[PDB]
């Protein structure tokens, strides 16, 4: 199916307190598989999924030096951005960077990504054609002209077209038992009285992977989406996710309400009811 | 696999 690989980077400066904090993470789909933290005693890229631990030492060295080098480049970029935006060296500022690739069900490239944010606002982003840039302001256009002169886009396009896809396919085969075997949600419905006239029907979806899921309440085959308290999908903490949707139903009408669960791990969309 | 690139602003 459709899959993705992503690398996230965050550099936060702390002037006078020392070096900026640097944290980078890698994700295949909704699975964290690598991390690097500058505040960690181990100044190296760490494995975060079991299927990446079969990678040899040469791999873990390369990813560590790249992460360290990204920490140093961000350090320099933050000082450069103070100059472009004419800011004092006293404030604390944030530099974020995201890059990666989507692949379709055939394993070919869907979309390539590389974008940078300064203090939460877009700075410069590679376009979809992998051959041009979108700059947010004149400060970012300074960087753009330099990156155009240094042919930054040609390397990113080669990586996004080649190494990014080929190594995402490699990860997908090595971790197929989890990355391509969706975890179905364990589901149940709870009943919580409010008054002597009304109660809450809360539909639960637990332990499912990936995070994409649809919880919908229906009263006699009619969508109650307008009056559904739906919570944002949240991590359980063991690589799976949780979600629930609630509706306020009149006392004695519970059986008229049905919770429908759609998920790629389900061989059939569930239809749950209040079961006392 | 991370990209190897040094592209200062």
């Amino acid at each position: 199916g459709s899959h993705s690989m992503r690398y996230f980077h965050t550099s936060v400066s702390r002037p006078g307190r020392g070096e900026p904090r640097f944290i980078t993470v890698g994700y295949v789909d909704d699975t964290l598989f690598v991390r690097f933290d500058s505040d960690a005693a181990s100044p190296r890229e760490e494995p975060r999924a079991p299927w990446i631990e079969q990678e040899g030492p040469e791999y873990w060295d390369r990813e560590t030096q790249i992460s360290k080098a990204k920490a140093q480049t961000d350090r320099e970029d933050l000082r450069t951005l103070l100059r472009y935006y004419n800011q004092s060296e006293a404030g604390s500022h944030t530099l974020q960077n995201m890059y990666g690739c989507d692949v379709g069900p055939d394993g070919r490239l869907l979309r390539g990504y590389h974008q940078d944010a300064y203090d939460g606002k877009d700075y410069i982003a590679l376009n979809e054609d992998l051959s041009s840039w979108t700059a947010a302001d004149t400060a970012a256009q300074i960087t753009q002209r330099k990156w155009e002169a240094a042919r930054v886009a040609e390397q990113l396009r080669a990586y996004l077209e080649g190494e990014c896809v080929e190594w995402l396919r490699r990860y997908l085969e090595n971790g197929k038992e989890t990355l391509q075997r969706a975890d179905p949600p364990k589901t149940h419905v709870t009943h919580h009285p409010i008054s002597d006239h009304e109660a809450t029907l809360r539909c639960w979806a637990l332990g499912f992977y990936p995070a994409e899921i649809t919880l919908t309440w229906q009263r006699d085959g009619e969508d109650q989406t307008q009056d559904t308290e739906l919570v944002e999908t949240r991590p359980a903490g063991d690589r799976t996710f949780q979600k629930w949707a609630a509706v306020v139903v009149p006392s004695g009408e519970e059986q008229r309400y049905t919770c429908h669960v759609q998920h790629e791990g389900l061989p059939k969309p569930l239809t749950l009811r209040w079961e006392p | 696999l991370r990209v190897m690139m040094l592209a200062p602003f």
Epitope: D61 | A7, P8
Partner: T-cell receptor, first 114, second 116 residues
Framework: SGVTQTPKHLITATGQRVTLRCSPR?????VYWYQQSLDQGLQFLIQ???????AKGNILERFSAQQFPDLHSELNLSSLELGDSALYFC?????????????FGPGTRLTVLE | KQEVTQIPAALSVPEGENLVLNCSFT??????LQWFRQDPGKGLTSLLL?????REQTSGRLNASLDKSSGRSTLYIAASQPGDSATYLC???????????????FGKGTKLSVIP
Amino acid sequence: SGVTQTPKHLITATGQRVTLRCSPRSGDLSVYWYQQSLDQGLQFLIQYYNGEERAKGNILERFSAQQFPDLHSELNLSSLELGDSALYFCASSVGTYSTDTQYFGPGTRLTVLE
Amino acid sequence: KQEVTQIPAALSVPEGENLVLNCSFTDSAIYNLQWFRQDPGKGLTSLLLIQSSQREQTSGRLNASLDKSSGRSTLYIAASQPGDSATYLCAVNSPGSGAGSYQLTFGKGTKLSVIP
């Protein structure tokens, strides 16, 4: 505009000191020094960027370098030995990009004799 | 630990015949690979630059290929002209000792002679 180096040639005695000058191309803020001996080939010595030392190779502590405000660079080779006889090249790039080209000067051929 | 090797150390090709120059390196983690031309009296000139993730680069009669997995590169010169006589150097840009550092590592080169 290209990288310029002076002097073109240098013949001096052991234990002496020499200074090699380099003017990078217009717009290039980083300078690089290389030593091309017969025994080791082209070897990276030191890299400066906008006056500040950025990268360093297996340069000896008796070899000193500097990048000045005008971006031109000097390489001081002191306590000269016979092994220091080599062709010393100067390079320069626009910045510190991993994606672009370093441009080289014609080099300074140094001969050290007993 | 990065070391570049070129075979052969010298080569003599008949004028007009295509040629190939080989290169190999020890560390697959590189930023770019370059092919240089060094002329006695003159300096060094970069002929081609292959990005870290590219496979080939072409400039006129020149075609270079990069294979980081095997750590090898090949420079193909078509229709060798007497002006191609020079020492061809293989360079890789790869990280140094410091974080964010990089440096060109050079092979000893291949002295090419195009006998007319």
